[PDB]
Design a protein around this ligand. Structure first.
Ligand SMILES: O=C(O)c1c[nH]c(-c2ccccc2)n1
Length: 144
């Protein structure tokens, strides 16, 4: 199995699924470049390094409330009810929101490590689960 992937058991259904401990992605089916290109949606919380964004001068939501918001956006994106770009534009606490959350291409050595590791472990087109850094909690979409 590719980097980060492990076989797991669903508590709900008792079916096997696969879980990636580097991206936090999970999927039902059984699943390195010099540069990748990613978009993200960042939800900040009261313990972020900078609890402020273009959306809200003072961010007061708890880390747990940020995680519920992230999980509801992942749900909508996976159901096809919303697309990732749309929710990044509206709700991301990063100023990249104005660019549909696009960060452009980057190599290793540039981003916070849990972000970098998640970005380089995703396949093209693949979205992470919740990824925690000192900025807050991210959903990451690898686009190249
Ligand atoms: O204000 C912050 O802490 C912040 C805003 N954006 C980011 C960020 C951008 C790209 C990758 C990881 C974090 N951090």
């Amino acid at each position: 199995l590719p980097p980060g992937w492990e076989k797991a058991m669903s508590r709900s259904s008792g079916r096997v699924y696969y879980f990636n401990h580097i991206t936090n992605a999970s999927q039902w089916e059984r699943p390195e470049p010099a540069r990748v290109r990613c978009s993200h949606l960042l939800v900040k919380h009261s313990q972020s390094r900078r609890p402020s964004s273009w959306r809200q001068e003072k961010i007061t939501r708890t880390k747990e409330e940020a995680l519920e918001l992230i999980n509801g956006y992942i749900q909508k994106i996976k159901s096809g009810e919303e697309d990732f770009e749309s929710l990044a534009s509206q709700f991301s606490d990063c100023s990249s929101a104005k660019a549909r959350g696009d960060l452009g291409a980057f190599s290793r050595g540039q981003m916070q490590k849990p972000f970098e590791d998640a970005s380089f472990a995703l396949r093209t087109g693949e979205m992470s689960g919740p990824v925690f850094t000192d900025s807050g909690i991210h959903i990451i979409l690898r686009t190249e």
